[PDB]
Amino acid sequence: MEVMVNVLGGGESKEITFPKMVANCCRFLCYFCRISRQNQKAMFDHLSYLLENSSVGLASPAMRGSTPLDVAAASVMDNNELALALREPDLEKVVRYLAGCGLQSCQMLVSKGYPDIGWNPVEGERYLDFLRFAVFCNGESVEENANVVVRLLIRRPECFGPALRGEGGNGLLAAMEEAIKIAEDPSRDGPSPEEDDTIHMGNAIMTFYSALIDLLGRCAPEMHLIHAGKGEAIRIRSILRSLIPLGDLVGVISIAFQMPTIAKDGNVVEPDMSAGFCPDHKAAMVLFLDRVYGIEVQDFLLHLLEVGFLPDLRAAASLDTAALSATDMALALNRYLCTAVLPLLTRCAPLFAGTEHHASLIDSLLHTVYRLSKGCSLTKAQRDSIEVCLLSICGQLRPSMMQHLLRRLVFDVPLLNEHAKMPLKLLTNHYERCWKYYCLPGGWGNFGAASEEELHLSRKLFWGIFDALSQKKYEQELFKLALPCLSAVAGALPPDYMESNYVSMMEKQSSMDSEGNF
């Protein structure tokens, strides 16, 4: 710390002399904090100094994670005692720095030749990250810090950026559209006299707005406090609702990415992730939506699913080819989906009851989720998220719609590969829940009865599983897990079943086609 103090004090006005050693010391302090929790408190004891020396190298890229602001963030990171002991003036200094960045242009970038705007996205994003780490800790939101931060943010409206500042701002959606337009525009994106040399203004703007939205969503009060009816929490949540309209969030979610493509030679042409709309931008939007506005309306849920959620999932499904799977676009999409969308759809499981009038939409969701499950780059935790989300949705899903999923499953589940395990669970739980629908001719009055096409498909599923399990090599866990499914199918099928000798011929030739079923 004393070495860093000496160097930062020496020639502070003329940027930072010897920036490499300053970055090394900041990295060492961050790692020292990460080593043990007591060291984190020991570094926290001097958090005040790092605040007045936060503006060291925030503008310059490739120094991220190696600035005094990063050291303060690491000292206040994931420690509840430290987050609670964090004082109000310490947050006020950072809020003032964010206000200064929102009011004033970036002198260093405009000197290097970047186009002049009235605010500082690159510094504002870092200052918003520090506030995120200050207010949000260990899944929960520290209410004491969140209320102070949101109050300071609303007392200084200039911290919200020009779009949400309120002097005729174009809005969050318009700001996002303009930022992407800048991103494709070469002149406005670059200084125009690898990445640290050319800071992309569009990406800076989008990351700033996504960080502000993320911070406010994390500052949103917990749902248990809302249920308790605490007036201060209600007030803060309503203030956040007023600050950010729901329609802007919906529009930003509706905005689509740019998919990678191969060229005439066939080589993969992949647009750089440092330039373009990132999935983390939508991840912040989803977090703000679920924590601030709340998702409790069925038609709203389906409308959002159609406008913004489903197109992205279908794009991820279309970019599941092996060559294009290795692209960092595909990895970012899978990360965003499995971190935000699928957990949100799992939390929205009860609302999926009344989906008869959007049968096509729910079938499309099921097909896209299944195709993403049938993937290679999908990690283990991502597979777990897919499994939980799909098993939850198909649970409250009415048996009438899922016969498309059943008819596509009966052809590829007999393979009994490792990818067939979650179809096995899905079929097990579905047949256990809809036992009386199939066996009893009457069934549930609201649900109705089998169309006998579902019955024939269940017959085919039963026979295929029965034969493939006999031809299948011994794996005792596989015979554990396939037992309840086979038993449920057998029980659901009525013993007096009529297999139609006149079956339907000339079936879907795409279904038998194993090359993606398309």
Binding site: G231, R235, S242, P245
Partner: protein, 538 residues
């Protein structure tokens, strides 16, 4: 010595605006019936245009700590910085609050500020904070001290919008500094003595006739003359005048002999003035200058004028007393005395004379708050319904719809407010309170009929029936007018039924117009209302 604001004290909130490089002094104003949204009334040029402080005055009911506010929400003391105070609008009786709805004047964060009927909730409450470093939390709030108000519910400061062409008051995160003026304090005000802002009747020395304008049957600018009538007019709304002092601060103080004041006619909204031809004439607020509209009360006809006296900050000494003190009205600049001309339905002309007669003594009688509020409501309804009728006339004359202004929302809101005003008492109420409500409703109906509110409603009904259908009215006027055509037409008939119900005199004067009403009974859009009105009259 410095005074401190206390509870139940009446105050006016002022804001300073330097529009077009010239400083203006504005006040927070609100109108009970009609537009609930607060607007700002200028008080800088009081010389050429009088200020309407009656709808600018607020009273401070309760000052409580924030935690006490939390506790009372869950289930005389001087104002101290940091408390949460409750403001009641003096005229309407409603409470200042954040309406949680915004005009969206490119200030989506801001919330509009209006009035609320119920004090329940944290929207009505506001917190006072020190304006500068000299002030501090917890200390007494001095009088004549600049203050900043913070909304409890929305955490948005009272803000004056400069960018927009028309200045608006709203709840925004930016701060606008509000000064507080002690308009009046009724705690130490002696009863029976005239104070500024009262509504009074000028009774001539024969204690039988009032200073009144021509009745409502005569059209506008035939009501501008000033004369004397006696008899039934003494209990009417055309004999009511408001004494407005030329000072903004401490304008509710006791009126002293020689204090300059303006006499405003409540039902017409005009100001008493002296024309160059020495003839009394009502004249408009816009041209109501101090020179023309200044009058003083003199104990005796003796010519030794008081001259100039220093003004006192506070109620002062009560000099003029109701019903016993004999007052002689004289114009300030001209120096003439008010007197009866004695021209040869008494119609004793009131004329302005150098010497006049000996029996020029004028007695003063205080008017009830219910009657004053009814008269102000009558004036506002007259203005709004004349705007409505003029808009309908322009639409009939085929003027372009965009040019013509049609107060669709305001007329409907005022109609519901009038329905609430003339709502009959409920049956479960206690007998004495019920009788009091019946007396008040009868008085309100009598005042409305004497001001002729029936004919205005009849004209509105006719000019809405000139359009056969809602689709036809949506073709002529705007689509929103098309949807509101049914609601406004039904509300007008309900208002007529409420005005005529239980009033034998009103139903008797409605006998001539009955035949007009029955001629449209076949029309389906108003059959129920027409039949209800007919049943009440019968």
């Amino acid at each position: 010595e410095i005074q401190f604001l206390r509870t139940d004290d009446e105050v006016v909130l002022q804001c300073t605006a330097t529009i077009h490089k010239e400083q203006q002094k504005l006040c927070l104003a609100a109108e009970g019936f009609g537009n609930r949204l607060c607007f700002l009334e200028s008080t800088s040029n009081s010389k050429n245009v009088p200020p309407d402080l009656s709808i600018c005055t607020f009273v401070l009911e309760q000052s409580l700590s924030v935690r006490a506010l939390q506790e009372m929400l869950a289930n005389h003391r001087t104002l101290l910085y940091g408390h949460a105070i409750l403001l009641r609008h003096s005229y309407s009786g409603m409470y200042l609050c954040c309406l949680s709805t915004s005009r969206s004047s490119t200030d989506k964060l801001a919330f509009d500020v209006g009035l609320q009927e119920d004090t329940t909730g944290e929207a009505c409450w506001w917190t006072i904070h020190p304006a500068s470093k000299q002030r501090s939390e917890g200390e007494k709030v001095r009088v004549g001290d600049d203050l900043i108000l913070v909304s409890v519910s929305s955490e948005r400061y009272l803000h004056l919008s400069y960018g927009n062409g028309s200045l608006h008051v709203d709840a925004a995160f930016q701060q606008t500094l509000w000064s507080v003026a002690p308009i009046s304090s009724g705690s130490e005000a002696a009863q029976g003595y005239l104070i500024g802002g009262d509504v009074l009747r000028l009774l001539h020395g024969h204690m039988d006739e009032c200073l009144t304008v021509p009745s409502g049957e005569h059209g506008e600018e035939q009501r501008r003359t000033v004369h004397y009538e006696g008899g039934a007019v003494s209990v009417h709304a055309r004999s009511l005048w408001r004494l407005e002092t030329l000072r903004v601060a401490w304008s509710g103080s006791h009126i002293r002999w020689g204090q300059p004041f303006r006499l405003r006619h409540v039902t017409t909204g005009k100001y008493l003035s002296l024309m160059e031809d020495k003839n009394l004439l009502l004249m408009d607020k816009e041209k109501a200058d101090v020179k023309s509209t200044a009058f003083t009360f003199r104990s005796s006809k003796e010519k030794l004028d008081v001259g100039v006296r220093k003004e006192v900050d506070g109620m002062g000494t009560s000099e003029i007393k109701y019903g016993d003190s004999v007052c002689y009205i004289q114009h300030v600049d001209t120096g003439l005395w008010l007197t009866y001309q004695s021209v040869d339905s008494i119609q004793r002309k009131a004329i302005m004379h150098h010497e006049g007669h000996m029996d020029d003594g004028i007695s003063l009688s205080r008017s009830q708050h219910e009657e004053s509020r009814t008269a102000r409501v009558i004036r506002s309804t007259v203005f709004l319904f004349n705007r409505f009728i003029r808009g309908l006339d322009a639409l009939s004359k085929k003027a372009k719809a965009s040019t013509v202004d049609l107060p669709i929302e305001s007329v409907s809101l005022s109609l519901q407010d009038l329905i609430g005003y003339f709502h009959p008492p409920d049956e479960h109420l206690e007998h004495e309170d019920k009788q009091n409500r019946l007396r008040a409703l009868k008085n309100r109906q009598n005042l409305f009929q004497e001001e002729g509110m029936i004919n205005l409603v009849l004209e509105c009904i006719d000019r809405l029936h000139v359009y056969s259908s809602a689709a036809h009215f949506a073709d002529v006027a705007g689509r929103e007018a098309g949807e509101s055509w049914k609601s406004i037409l039904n509300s007008l008939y309900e208002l007529l039924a409420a005005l005529i119900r239980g009033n034998r005199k009103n139903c008797a004067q409605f006998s001539g117009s009955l035949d007009w009403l029955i001629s449209r009974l076949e029309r389906l859009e108003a059959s129920s209302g027409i039949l209800e009105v007919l049943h009440c009259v019968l």
